[PDB]
Amino acid sequence: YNPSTTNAKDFVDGSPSEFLVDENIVTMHSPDVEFDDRLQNITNGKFKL
C-alpha cells in the first residue's frame, strides 16, 4: 500500500479475508520429526540451514 494515500487498516479492510504466501517463514517437514518424538520437543534450537 502507498502510505501517503491510505493507512494499513483502511487498506486491509478492502479484503481482510485475503491470504498471502510467505517464503520468509517456512515449515520444514522431515520423517525424523514425525517418527522420532525427541524432535517434537525442540524449543528455540540454534541451528543453521
Partner 1 sequence: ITKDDYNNADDFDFVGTIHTSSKIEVSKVNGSGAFGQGVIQYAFTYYNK
Interface of this chain with partner 1, residues 8 to 47, rule: CB under 8 A: 38, 41-42
Rounded to whole angstroms, the Cα distance separating 26 from 45 reads 15
Question: Residue 2: left if φ>0, alpha if ψ -120 to 50, beta else—which one?
Answer: beta
Confirm or reject binding of residue 49 to partner 1 (CB under 8 A): no
For residue 11, give every residue at least 6 positions away whose Cβ sits within 8 Å of its Cβ, in sequence order, or none.
1
- Whichever of 24 and 43 has its CB closer to partner 1, that residue is 43
- Whichever of 18 and 37 has its CB closer to partner 1, that residue is 37
Where do contacts with partner 1 occur on this chain (CB under 8 A)?
A: 38, 41-42
